[PDB]
Design a protein around this ligand. Structure first.
Ligand SMILES: [Mg+2]
Ligand SMILES: [Mg+2]
Ligand SMILES: [Zn+2]
Ligand SMILES: [Zn+2]
Lengths: 333, 328
């Protein structure tokens, strides 16, 4: 085991004011800040600020030598780009999310050049829930899709263990699955007044599970494959759909869950529960809401397995009619 | 705010990676706290101080940027304490695996919470060679997560204490896997799995910001025993894990009574302790039966922490439990 986790995690109103404090604790003196256009107001303690596009337009090294860490502030592009650059410079990364739409906040995954790959987990995570609470509702709702997908990811991971002898950690699996279960239970039973707070905790916890298992397995399975497949097709058919990753994964979760349910009667009804919790926080549950033609969903399901060399309930592949059947049995079309 | 380790290593040869890790953390001048037996592993230029020099008696330490604790539990705990005092990071390098102080943010009475070690470097080649007794006693520290978790739930339910189901389950599952391993294998990898378990259990504490997932009524029972050793001036050399394992057998029984769902649990725990040659009875432990009984009776008062013991155990109830469970 060689495991990298965060050193400091903060999740509270006002958190953004503690960046200084944390840098001091970590004995970090000169951070490079990676951020975006409309987050410059949260950056007013620092001096070296770079926008993520500068980096993304040339992903290649000896002009950053003076910096001892990187601080990513803002949305997902900001955090992912900052994480990437820290990895490249071999220095620690500090995650300061202003949104909470996915688990890149705390995870050691970089999703700049899909496929994703594994780097070090951020050394600190500073999640100001006063700021995150005011992020676009749509991004918060999409966070739900990212969390519920731990369920199918864990089911796929067990399946891969059983059927293919893949490395599996029961205690990471259960942690990741339970994080999502608690979040689902909260959205189904509360007034949702603390959702943002609990979403962030879930996203973060889910990040830790990944670090702890040294794999994205506890957080990503066939539902994510389905999502990547959708993305390919948006590009390949030049669609203009503004669809978010977590929205897509949530819907992938509904469906993949149903495939598991067929094989494992003990899980029957799980997909309806996931469906419910997504509805309850305003997250899409069908292609129409998501914005797609039915044929794209079907095609995406049929080509999900090929996306990555990762065993899942999809197995050797779905047929176009198994696909349709699933999508319609499932309410997605 | 949650403080966890940054780097955790569990492998054969791990001790050789101390420099590699210090460099990754940009630390340059560690003070090493250790014991006489463990100098053999202190193959480096760093200043070395023995834990008793500290325990018998601030500005001699200003030039150090971290503390590295190498050895047994006194070493790790004394090193953790001093790091906290100097406001510098602590690196845990255990040579034995008798308890979860290896990776926890706990200093130990009453124990208190500091930062979790910034790194944990557990060399399983070294740990494999530790005295059998100490490894067996690790089992007692792990199985006690089961009752700790049960007490936590209970306190949540009955007293609306702050509870994290995902932390609870993580801790409980760690112990379940370790129990399952010792009941079903040849134990050839026990030391390896015990260490992973002790470390995981440490992370659970850091993550919940509480010892709850790792420590409950069974630890109360242990602390009570300890008080009585001191208070009666007994010369018993009984280890913390050994005491907690026995506490776990008994406390699990209390939970079983109330929850038929848990039927058989205490015998499972007893079995797993037997399987690694850990004590399950007072006589193996070293004690008179009255000490056990008195310790049960006064366990709840030890700290303000609701458990299955609730308001307290009566002397008859205590005896009855201790004998129903084979401990006396
Ligand atoms: Mg996920
Ligand atoms: Mg324990
Ligand atoms: Zn995702
Ligand atoms: Zn303990």
């Amino acid at each position: 085991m060689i495991i990298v986790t965060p050193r400091y995690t903060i999740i509270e109103d006002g958190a953004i004011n503690k960046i200084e404090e944390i840098l001091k604790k970590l004995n970090l003196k000169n951070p490079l800040v990676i951020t975006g256009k409309n987050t410059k107001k949260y950056c007013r303690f620092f001096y070296d600020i770079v926008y993520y596009d500068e980096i993304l337009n040339n992903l290649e090294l000896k002009k950053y030598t003076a910096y001892d860490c990187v601080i990513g502030i803002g949305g997902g592009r900001s955090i992912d780009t900052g994480k990437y650059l820290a990895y490249k410079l071999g220095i620690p990364f500090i995650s300061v999310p202003t949104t909470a739409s996915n688990d890149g906040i705390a995870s050691p995954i970089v999703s700049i050049r899909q496929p994703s790959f594994m780097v070090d987990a951020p050394i600190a995570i500073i999640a100001d829930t006063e700021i995150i609470k005011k992020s676009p509702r749509r991004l918060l709702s999409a966070g739900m899709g990212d969390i519920v997908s731990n369920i199918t990811a864990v089911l796929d991971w067990k399946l891969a263990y059983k059927e293919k002898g893949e490395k599996y950690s029961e205690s990471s699996a259960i942690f990741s699955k339970t994080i999502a279960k608690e979040l689902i239970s909260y959205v189904l039973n509360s007034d949702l007044s603390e959702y943002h707070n609990k979403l962030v905790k879930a996203l973060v916890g889910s990040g830790i599970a990944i670090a702890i298992a040294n794999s994205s397995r506890p957080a990503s399975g066939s539902e994510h494959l389905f999502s990547h497949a959708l993305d390919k097709l948006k590009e390949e058919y030049n669609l203009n759909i503004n669809s978010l990753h977590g929205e897509q994964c949530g819907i992938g979760t509904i469906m993949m869950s149903y495939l598991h349910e067929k094989e494992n009667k003990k899980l029957s009804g799980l997909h309806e529960k996931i469906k419910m919790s997504l509805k309850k926080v305003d997250a899409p549950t069908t292609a129409k809401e998501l914005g797609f033609d039915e044929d794209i969903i079907i095609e995406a399901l049929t080509m999900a397995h090929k996306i990555r060399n990762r065993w899942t309930i999809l197995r050797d592949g779905l047929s176009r009619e198994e696909a349709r059947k699933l999508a319609e049995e499932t309410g997605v079309i």
